Design a protein around this nucleic acid. Structure first.
Length: 92
DNA sequence: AGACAGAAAGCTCAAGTACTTAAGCCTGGTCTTCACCGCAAAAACGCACGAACGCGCAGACCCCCGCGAAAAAACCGCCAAGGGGAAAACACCCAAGACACCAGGCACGAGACAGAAAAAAACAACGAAAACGGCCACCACCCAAACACACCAAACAC
């Protein structure tokens, strides 16, 4: 039962485009994409942590990594989204 | 009132103490110039876990061989337009000069802010029980794959 991001990418698609489906080949592309972005961000956060002699990866490390990797408006909106989500989550 | 005496500062004259020098030149050799202090991190050896090792079974799936339809791939030929060569020329860039700027070097001052130290707690990891989200199995539906018709419209000729 080798695990994947499929259910979520289909949930998000159904939210943004209720009448649009997804081929298996394109679904594979999305899984690869998610995995790749995950590894870019986590790796940058790891480097940041090591440089500053810290042992925990917190939201600050992730935010900075996002700012370093995502170009322009992609970064600005991603940061907004991430901040909104961690705000909503802490205040439950 | 004055005359006598005693008590004074003074003054001088013997003991004790601090300080100084100690011939000129010359030749070799040997020895030594922070010592004792102790943390860093590279390393020794035991102990216990557990990750990877072995080996055995399952079967999935990769290799090989077969025949046919179909198409792309190979070969040949005309030829046109494109790559390349030669030529003009003009004004774009390099070169040389004189005058001047500001980069560079050194200096000192002030202090913002980086690195360290000591405290203190909120936050992450651990063990545990728990149940529901995400996976597999398998069904049915309809998007796009396909074939057949057709109108449309770019191409090139004149």
């Amino acid at each position: 039962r080798k695990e994947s991001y499929s259910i979520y990418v289909y949930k998000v698609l159904k939210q943004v485009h209720p009448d649009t489906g997804i081929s298996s080949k394109a679904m594979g592309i999305m899984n690869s994409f998610v995995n790749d972005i995950f590894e870019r961000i986590a790796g940058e956060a790891s480097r940041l942590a090591h440089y500053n002699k810290r042992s925990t990866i917190t939201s600050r490390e992730i935010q900075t990594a996002v700012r370093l990797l995502l170009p322009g408006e992609l970064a600005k909106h991603a940061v907004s989204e991430g901040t909104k989500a961690v705000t909503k989550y802490t205040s439950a």
